[PDB]
Each structure stands twice: as C-alpha cells, then as structure tokens.
UniProtKB/Swiss-Prot annotation:
Species this protein is from: Homo sapiens (Human)
Residues that hold substrate according to the record: I266, E267, N280, Q294, Y335, N409, W410, G411, C412, G413, A414
Enzyme nomenclature, EC number: 3.2.1.143
GO CC term, one of those recorded: nucleoplasm
Free-text comment on this protein's domains from its UniProt entry: The PIP-box mediates interaction with PCNA and localization to replication foci.
Catalytic activity: [(1''->2')-ADP-alpha-D-ribose](n) + H2O = [(1''->2')-ADP-alpha-D-ribose](n-1) + ADP-D-ribose
Name of the protein in its database record: Poly(ADP-ribose) glycohydrolase
Record-stated family: Belongs to the poly(ADP-ribose) glycohydrolase family.
Effect of N280A: Reduced poly(ADP-ribose) glycohydrolase activity
Tissues/organs with expression: Ubiquitously expressed.
Source species, domain of life: Eukaryota
Cited function: Poly(ADP-ribose) glycohydrolase that degrades poly(ADP-ribose) by hydrolyzing the ribose-ribose bonds present in poly(ADP-ribose). PARG acts both as an endo- and exoglycosidase, releasing poly(ADP-ribose) of different length as well as ADP-ribose monomers. It is however unable to cleave the ester bond between the terminal ADP-ribose and ADP-ribosylated residues, leaving proteins that are mono-ADP-ribosylated. Poly(ADP-ribose) is synthesized after DNA damage is only present transiently and is rapidly degraded by PARG.
Length: 501
C-alpha cells in the first residue's frame, strides 16, 4: 500500500476543526499593524496608525526609513536616490545597492545576480525584469513608511508574543530585504542582531551555484505577483516558549492516531494541518544564502515566511515559531542540486475570520548529531521531545479543535538524526499534546511500514507515552551508553523484544 494506518480523511484539519476566532485586537502580547475595524474580505488592509511612527531601540526592528538611520546624512534619502534610477544592466542594480552599503563593496559578491540576468534569462525575460519587476519592487520598497507605520517588536528570546500584519506590509518589507536596506543587519562581527538570522538578501547574489537561478526565479515569481496585485490577507507570527514540560516517564496518556505514507508532501497533502518546518534555530536556515532543503524550500514557495527572519531571535531549546496565514506562490520539484522552480501557484486555501490563509506552519529545530549515538542520550531525547511538544501544544484548546500534525523525518538525512527514533519522538510529543500524526516518509516505503508496525504494536498493547519513553531509556543504557559507532541492535527490534519478553 502507499499509506498505512488511519485514513487521512479521518484526520482533523482547519478550518473545519477550529473554534470561532476571538475578535482580532491588539494587546500586551499581540501587536496588530492594521485597522481591525476596517478588515474586510477582498480589501487591502489599512495600516494602523495612519502616520508613520518610529522606534529606534533594542526592542524593535530598526527600519530603513527611520530618521535615525544616518550615515551625517539620511540613509533613507540615499536609498531613494540610489534606487530611483533606470536599470538596464545588472551592474546598475549592483551599483545602486552598494551606494548605501559602501562598507560592503568589496565583501559582497553579485555574481549570481549578474549571471541570472545576463546568462540565465532570455532577452525578453531580462527586459521584463528591469522594465517592470524591478521598478515595481523599488516602488513598494520605497513606500515602506506609508505601509509599515507601526513599530515592529522583536520576537526576542523567552517572549510569548504575536505579530499580525498584512501580506502587503510583508511584501514591502521583503522588497527592502531584496535591496539590502535593513540597517545593522550586515556585519560579520556585529554584536547587535548577532542572535538574529540574516534578513538582507545579499548572499542570494553571491557565487555560481546552479541553485541560485532557481531561488531567484522562485522569489521573482512572488515579487511579480504581489507588486502586480496587492494581496489582501493577514499573517500571524507567534513565538511560543514553554516552562512546564512533561515528566515523560510518568505520562499516562495513550498514543494518538497515525497515518503514515511514503508518497506526498507536508505542504500539498497536509492542507489545514499543523505543518512542520524542519527548522534551523535561526529560522529559515540558509534561505537567503546557500541552503535549499526542506525549510529553505518552504520559505521560498511561501516567501512571507522569510520576514520572520527580520524579527525572530534564534530559538532556544524550549521555543518555537508558529506562522499562520502564509500563501503559496510557487510550485517546485526536487531539492538541493535538483531543486527547480516549476510554475506560479494560485493558492486556493480558505481564509479564516482574521483573513489569514488556513495554513499553519511551526518551525521547530532539531539538534545536529555529528556522532550517531549521541542522539540516544536521555538529555538529548528529552530535548527533542520537549521541542516537538512545544511546537505541537496549544495551551487553551480542546483536542477536538486541534488539527493533526503533518510531519516527516525531522532532523534526519544529513543532519544525523535517526528517522525511526525521530518518528517515535514526534509520535510521543503529539500524543502528549493530544494531536494525531500524519507522517510523510518522502519516498521511503520500508520506513513507512516500520513506523506503522511499531505504532500498531504499541497501541494494541496499550502502552502509554511514559511506557514508551522508559523503553527509549532502556535502549540507551543497554545498547548505546557502553557501546562501535553503531549499536549492536536497532531501536525498534529492541523495543519489540523488550515488550514481548
Ligand atoms: C516529509 N517531507 C520531507 S522529509 C522533505 N524533505 C525535503 S528536502 C530534503 C531534505 O530536507 N534533507 C535531505 C538530507 O539533507 C538533510 C535533509 N522536502 C520534504 N518535504 C516537502 C516533505 O514533505
Ligand atoms: C558501571 As556503569 C554500566 O553504570 O557505567
């Protein structure tokens, strides 16, 4: 079979499973950058406040249009002068960006941007780029102070805080990121913002990887769409940090349901489910540089995700980022060296009562394991359980109103994670958060069968979360702690034998 377990049609999905949303309102823990009283389906949201207000401090985004962005001269005036010039050749765009980035004129390479424009695009495509797309991107970037009128707080470590902004606001911010206008976000040896991801796009322009043209095609598809017709919805970014984590060995909860399949993807076949982003602790990973696996791909096809890098501090072990409302603008095939932009995508997702696409993505970063056996250390297993639990738990929500989790081999492949361990870890965290699991093994049919078989074995024997966790601890002591780079017996065979004996 191509899938095993509970039929996916029986799993909960938004919007059907959700409760009616409360009235959208700003508060101490929720920044809302648009006029809620004027929010109407199909209408571009109106910014609140009406006139630009600036904060230039350690708790908010430093906006390029701030009067405090100086060089003294006004860097925003210099950005305007630089970008309001005709572009006909890629050197013109390089020269423009460097006019307000003089300190980086010898550090920043533009080879990929030059090669995209001169050596990848056909003549008519290049002409469309410089006669239409780039000027429209400049115009939306320079409109920033009229679009993003409210200071944007940083989602800093240990904050439980949400930001809800319009897709149009995100588009203006991302156009600024493309033109590398965000101040204090560039230096290799910076102290301020050293714990934040890169936001300016200069590393997308570096080098000769065949991957860069594909990334640029994907992002220009987005920019062409959102400059031609303003998107009308909202997106919410929520940093969540939990303090009370389960005593896993004592957890008496049963496992929940499982659908596991070797076909399909999280983003296409997990519509309306909690979709896992296999994140880097710096959210988005190398999306703005050289990375092109699961997280970076999702950030390219749903580029509104990228703006999380503007304001999201690196995730600590007990934290996640939850993004609701991002829209899919592109389709793709492959990954890494085989990644290719396929075509524009018209997102057909319903919107919720806050005009957010019914798409919820959670960024949870797995650990990297240089040594395979390090991941079976109890402290490391508990770390991964608590990370996934934080990503899945919604404190004030009945289980009946929680969608299934759509996930897969989180932290595996090149990152060193063991897929069978990581599947069981996510199954346990989902059970503790009272959510069902939809697991995509991404072509591995044997893994599908193994996960299904283990799940059915444990559920039929009524093993609790704590019973299973204790078996993981036994496996570590018996096969890992005193162990060769690999254990003598694998995890699932160990579990089967331990339980049946
Ligand atoms: C479940 N699922 C999975 S697993 C997935 N993987 C990728 S890209 C390859 C990748 O991330 N690697 C390979 C080794 O290097 C480290 C990790 N896209 C994915 N999608 C869309 C998905 O739904
Ligand atoms: C003596 As021992 C197996 O607890 O390291």
């Amino acid at each position: 079979k191509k899938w095993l377990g509970t039929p996916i049609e029986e799993m909960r999905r938004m919007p059907r499973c959700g409760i009616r949303l409360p009235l959208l309102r700003p508060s101490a823990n929720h920044t809302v950058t648009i006029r809620v009283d004027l929010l109407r389906a199909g209408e571009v949201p109106k910014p609140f406040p009406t006139h630009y207000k600036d904060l230039w401090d350690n708790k908010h985004v430093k906006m390029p249009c701030s009067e405090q962005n100086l060089y003294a001269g006004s860097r925003w005036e210099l950005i305007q002068t630089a970008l309001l010039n005709k572009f006909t050749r890629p050197q013109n765009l390089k020269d423009a960006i460097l006019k307000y980035n003089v300190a980086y004129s010898k550090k920043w390479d533009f080879t990929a941007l030059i090669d995209f424009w001169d050596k990848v695009l056909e003549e008519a495509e290049a002409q469309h780029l410089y006669q239409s797309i780039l000027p429209d991107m400049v115009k939306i970037a320079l409109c920033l102070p009229n679009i993003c009128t409210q200071p944007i707080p940083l989602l800093a470590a240990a904050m439980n805080h949400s930001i809800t902004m319009s897709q149009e606001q995100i588009a203006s911010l991302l156009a600024n990121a493309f033109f590398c206008t965000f101040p204090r976000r560039n230096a290799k040896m910076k102290s301020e913002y050293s714990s934040y991801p890169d936001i300016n796009f200069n590393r997308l322009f570096e080098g000769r990887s065949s991957r860069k043209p594909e990334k640029l095609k994907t992002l220009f598809c987005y920019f062409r769409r959102v400059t031609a017709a303003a998107p009308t919805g909202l997106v919410t970014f929520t940093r969540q940090s939990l303090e009370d984590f389960p005593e896993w060995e004592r957890c008496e909860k049963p496992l929940t349901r499982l659908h596991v399949t070797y076909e399909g993807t999280i983003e296409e076949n997990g519509q309306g489910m909690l979709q896992v982003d296999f994140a880097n602790r710096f959210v988005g990973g190398g999306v703005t540089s050289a990375g092109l696996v699961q997280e970076e791909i999702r950030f390219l096809i749903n580029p509104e995700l990228i703006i999380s890098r503007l304001f999201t501090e690196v995730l600590d072990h007990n934290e996640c980022l939850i993004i609701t409302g991002t829209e899919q603008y592109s389709e793709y095939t492959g990954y890494a060296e085989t990644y290719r932009w396929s075509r524009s995508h018209e997102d057909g997702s319903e919107r919720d009562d806050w005009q957010r696409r019914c798409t919820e993505i959670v960024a949870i970063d797995a650990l990297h394991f240089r040594r395979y056996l390090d991941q079976f250390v109890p402290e490391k297993m508990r770390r991964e359980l608590n990370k996934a639990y934080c990503g899945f738990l919604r404190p004030g929500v009945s289980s009946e109103n929680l969608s299934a989790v759509a996930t897969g081999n989180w932290g595996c492949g090149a990152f060193g994670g063991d897929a069978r361990l990581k599947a069981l870890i996510q199954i346990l965290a989902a059970a503790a958060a009272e959510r069902d699991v939809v697991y995509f093994t991404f072509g591995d049919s044997e893994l599908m069968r193994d996960i299904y078989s283990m799940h059915i074995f444990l559920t039929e024997r009524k093993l609790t979360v704590g019973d299973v966790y204790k078996l993981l601890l036994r496996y570590y002591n018996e096969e890992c702690r005193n162990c060769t780079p690999g254990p003598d017996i694998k995890l699932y065979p160990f579990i089967y034998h331990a339980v049946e004996s």
